[PDB]
Design a protein around this ligand. Structure first.
Ligand SMILES: COc1cccc(NC(=O)C#Cc2cc(C3=NN(C(C)C)C(=O)[C@@H]4CC=CC[C@H]34)ccc2OC)c1
Ligand SMILES: [Mg+2]
Ligand SMILES: [Zn+2]
Length: 333
């Protein structure tokens, strides 16, 4: 944990984002990346602006300097992989902002919980190597053995929580230094519960718990708040198909490259390679995206909007039109 320099901060604060509304559901992070020769500084500046314009750091005694220290300690710990890089967690951060403030999910949570969600977005994939839980277990890699021996199958999610806690133990980058007692505890418990909940192995069980709680006027209030945070970070994590088609498509290309590289190492290591991770299967993006929409994202967003989050209806509208756009790529091939 080397301290952030005056020079590193200045490199972010100078970025100005002319033309961009970071609060908008149609904000394009790809356009912002190649809109300078410092795409990393810009992403950091998008996150800084999102966090300050919410007004939440101020209310919880997090200075502008500590907040930016934190953004930059987070950025140092992401890797040059095609999808689970710093652009992805900044995307999840901005998208969660749209769900909270354009979708009015802010009304369901306290300000501390909204603050936690925006911060968690930035830690939720720390030190991701472009390989899924499954890779580590099948290869009996050290991390996989450690997870298996410890009894926790969520290999990556526990790695991420470990580095989050590392960054927050230095008061110079603890966005929660302003909290004490129950509030500091709730902040850490909820950041950890949310990251652990991004493991897609628990997708069905997290979705069903959230919906059972929303249907129950006598749900425990604390438990409902908690499940709402977990569902919102999960929503942000599978949000690529809720964006304007060309944005959705570039995300999909980036995730496919990352899966294909895992498939290359699984071959050179002679372990099971799924159809989807095999470069020499050349499966069509269109059928891929439609499959993801039909089996994961459409039912997910439709059910949470209907159950509770009416303000997020636009996500369901966009998945419908992205699907029809993929059906058109098929109909004209
Ligand atoms: C038939 O069901 C399918 C299921 C999955 C993919 C496809 N095919 C694609 O073309 C794609 C994509 C795709 C896949 C993901 C993810 N997937 N998952 C599992 C569901 C396999 C992860 O755990 C990733 C890590 C954490 C959260 C979500 C991430 C995210 C965005 C995607 O698109 C832009 C078809
Ligand atoms: Mg993850
Ligand atoms: Zn993620």
């Amino acid at each position: 944990v080397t301290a952030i320099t005056k020079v590193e901060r200045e490199a972010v604060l100078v970025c100005e984002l002319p033309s961009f509304d970071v609060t908008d559901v149609e904000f394009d992070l790809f356009r912002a990346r190649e809109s300078t020769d410092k795409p990393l500084d810009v992403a950091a500046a998008i996150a800084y602006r999102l966090l300050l314009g919410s007004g939440l750091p101020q209310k919880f005694g997090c200075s502008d300097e500590v907040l930016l220290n934190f953004i930059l300690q987070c950025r140092k710990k992401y890797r040059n992989v095609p999808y689970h890089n710093f652009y992805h967690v900044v995307d999840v951060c901005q998208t969660i902002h749209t769900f909270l403030y354009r979708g009015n999910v802010y009304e369901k949570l306290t300000e501390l919980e909204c603050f936690v969600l925006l911060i968690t977005a930035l830690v939720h994939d720390l030190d991701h190597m472009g390989l899924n839980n499954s890779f580590y277990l099948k290869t009996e890699s050290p991390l996989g053995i450690l997870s298996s021996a410890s009894g926790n199958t969520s290999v990556l999610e526990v790695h991420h929580c470990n580095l989050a806690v590392e960054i927050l133990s230095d008061p110079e980058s603890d966005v929660f230094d302003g909290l004490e007692g129950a509030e500091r505890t709730l902040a850490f418990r909820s950041m950890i519960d949310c990251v652990l909940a991004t493991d897609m192995a628990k997708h069905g069980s997290a979705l069903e718990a959230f919906l059972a709680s929303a249907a129950d006027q006598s749900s425990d209030e604390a438990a409902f708040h908690r499940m709402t945070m977990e569902i919102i970070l999960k929503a942000g994590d599978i949000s690529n198909v809720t964006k304007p088609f060309d944005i959705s498509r570039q995300w999909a290309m980036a995730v496919t490259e990352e899966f294909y590289r895992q498939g290359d190492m699984e071959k050179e290591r002679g372990v099971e390679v799924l159809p989807m991770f095999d470069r020499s299967k050349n499966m069509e993006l269109a059928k891929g995206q439609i499959g993801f929409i039909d089996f994961v994202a459409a039912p997910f967003f439709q059910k949470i909007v209907d159950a509770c989050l009416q303000g997020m209806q636009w996500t369901v509208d966009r998945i419908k039109s992205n699907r029809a756009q993929w059906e058109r790529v098929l109909e004209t091939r």
